[PDB]
Design a protein around this ligand. Structure first.
Ligand SMILES: CC(=O)N[C@H]1[C@H](O[C@H]2[C@H](O)[C@@H](N)[C@H](O)O[C@@H]2CO)O[C@H](CO)[C@@H](O)[C@@H]1O
Ligand code: NA
Ligand SMILES: [Zn+2]
Length: 407
């Protein structure tokens, strides 16, 4: 194969998710679904009476369910969040304005999302393809938290004033909006809870979200495969338009991203309704795209395999990344994996390479890294691999507390 496509769908579960899933299942393709549980509660202002049926269908036919927050940060679009807020915000179109405010509360709505999933589907954690606690994507934001050395933030994704498609909109990369700054902190909070977050390379979408009837203006399947081709190994998260879709700081050429294209789309574009004739026009586009992409040599996979799962018998070069029991590790030395030598907090073959910033065991720390431990921040003074006896509060040579006189 020439590469791997990760088809990802945002903002379900809604009635239209069932039609999208039915298209995928007809060709055996598995997608990753970034869900918002407010649709299960019936307050997300979509056709969503079949939301629970859509959630069950995704899980029952092998698609990966991931965490997109409870209500897509719409509490930040209105004065008081309630059952009608999704409709109120749809009437203004103001979703991107002040979309992130208090990052601790905003991050907490990812945790709320899981509480609601597990209420509506009590056996959801018996599904191996339920990744709600481990994989996330931030509303509006092409931001990434993959490894300790693979992060990116959408520095123009959300605004304090104008929508990014309005003519007077200005983004200053050196002084981002307060909403952007808050979304960066949200990324960091999730990473410390063990999430990875994934953005996207290409977006099957209207040119910009100010276009009326945005389901009517979707790229044809053949032209869209051309966009996927152009994104392969070209650092598309940094070059994508419009400016609010860019992932600034994305590490071009990073090995984990080689030969991969993450595709974003939204199931609500595949419905005949308020956004246009999306079912009539775009479900055939999606079906055709699956066929022509496979014919061109792409394979489809889900985001849980984007960072490959550690496997007995695999061959790892020094520096290769895996996940093991949901934690990211980096190989210390080239080796062939054996069943009794899995990655761990004490393994000599691996170090923990989670994108988290709390102090953690068995991390390869570099001078200048900042860790949090027992509620205090410390600078790493000298590179080392952390271990249980070298906690920051006990090692003045390795760490300097940001409140110490040694700083
Ligand atoms: C116009 C429209 O359909 N808006 C919906 C909104 O879409 C947002 C996407 O989720 C983001 N990925 C993108 O960056 O910005 C668009 C536009 O705001 O999503 C919300 C939540 O599902 C929905 O309520 C809006 O109708
Ligand atoms: Na994790
Ligand atoms: Zn979304």
């Amino acid at each position: 194969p020439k590469g791997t496509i990760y088809l990802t769908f945002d903002d379900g579960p809604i009635n239209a998710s069932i039609d999208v899933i039915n298209v995928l299942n007809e060709q055996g393709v598995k997608g990753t679904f970034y869900f918002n549980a407010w649709h299960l509660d019936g307050i997300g202002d979509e056709n969503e009476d079949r939301a629970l049926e859509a959630l069950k269908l995704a899980l029952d036919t092998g698609h990966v369910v991931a965490n997109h927050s409870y209500a897509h940060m719409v509490h930040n679009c209105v004065d008081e969040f309630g059952p009608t807020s999704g409709a109120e915000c749809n009437a203004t179109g103001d979703h991107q304005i002040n979309a992130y405010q208090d990052p601790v509360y905003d991050a907490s709505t990812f945790a709320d999302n899981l509480v609601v999933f597990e209420r509506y589907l009590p056996n959801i954690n018996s599904y191996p393809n339920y990744f709600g606690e481990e994989l996330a994507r931030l509303p509006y934001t092409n931001g990434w938290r993959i490894t300790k050395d693979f992060k990116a933030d959408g520095l123009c994704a959300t605004s304090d004033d104008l929508k990014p498609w309005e003519p007077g909109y200005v983004c200053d990369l050196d002084n981002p909006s307060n909403s952007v700054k808050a979304s960066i902190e949200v990324q960091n909070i999730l990473a410390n809870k063990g999430y990875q977050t994934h953005g996207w390379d290409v977006d099957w979408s209207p040119e910009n979200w100010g276009i009326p009837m945005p389901a009517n203006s979707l790229t044809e399947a053949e032209a869209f495969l051309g966009y996927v081709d152009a994104a392969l190994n070209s650092c598309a998260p940094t070059t994508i338009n419009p400016i609010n879709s860019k992932a600034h700081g994305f590490p071009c050429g990073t090995p984990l991203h080689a030969d991969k294209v993450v595709v974003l789309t939204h199931e609500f574009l595949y419905e005949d309704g308020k956004r246009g004739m999306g079912a009539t026009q775009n479900l055939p586009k999606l079906a055709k795209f699956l066929r022509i992409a496979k014919e061109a040599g792409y394979v489809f996979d889900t985001i849980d395999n984007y960072t490959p799962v550690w496997q007995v018998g695999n061959a790892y070069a020094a520096g290769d990344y895996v996940t093991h029991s949901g934690t990211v590790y980096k190989a210390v030395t080239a080796h062939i994996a054996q069943q009794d030598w899995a990655p761990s907090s004490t393994s000599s073959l691996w170090t923990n390479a989670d994108p988290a910033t709390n102090w953690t065991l068995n991390v390869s720390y570099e001078a200048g890294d900042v860790v949090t431990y027992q509620g205090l921040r410390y600078l790493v003074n000298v590179p080392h691999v952390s271990q249980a006896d070298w906690t920051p509060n006990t090692q003045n040579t390795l760490f300097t507390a940001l409140r110490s006189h040694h700083h």
